[PDB]
Amino acid sequence: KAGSFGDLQSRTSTSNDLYANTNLKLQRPQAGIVHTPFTQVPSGFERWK
């Protein structure tokens, strides 16, 4: 649910398959500079702590 506990789920600590839905949305760069902005909800594991 992107904000509570399963924003990032991994079967093992060294596993290669990752589940991740963090509502990552890209944003338009402004005023003629090269940078990549984005907006996303914070980590629910940090919120669960």
């Binding site: 944003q27 760069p29 402004q30 940078h35 902005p37």
Partner: protein, 105 residues
């Protein structure tokens, strides 16, 4: 910006007694709670971008002297919009605000 002989933006002048001294700006510091980064100076006025706090103090080194003056004025941070941020972001929404001008005119 004046050195008692013309116009030069790297110079300042003051009085120590009845003699109007003139030096070069070596360490002109403005701090509130953290050191601010000043923008411009013209005559009696200094423009600076300061963090919030309860005191405003400026100073300049003449020789080995200090020359500090600390006034007690409460300065806050005023965000624009419907979110209360504490430092202006890298990216977001351009919104109209009201700020002091960079230019001297």
């Amino acid at each position: 910006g004046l050195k008692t002989d013309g116009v030069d933006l790297a110079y300042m002048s003051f009085m120590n007694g009845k003699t109007q001294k003139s030096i070069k700006i070596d360490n002109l510091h403005v701090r509130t709670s953290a050191p601010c980064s000043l923008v411009s100076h013209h005559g009696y006025y200094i423009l600076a971008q300061c963090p919030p706090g309860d005191t405003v103090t400026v100073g300049f080194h003449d020789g080995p002297n200090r020359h500090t003056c600390t006034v007690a004025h409460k300065v806050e941070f005023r965000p624009v919009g419907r979110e209360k941020y504490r430092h202006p972001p890298e990216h977001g929404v351009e919104l109209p605000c009201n700020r002091y001008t960079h230019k001297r005119a």
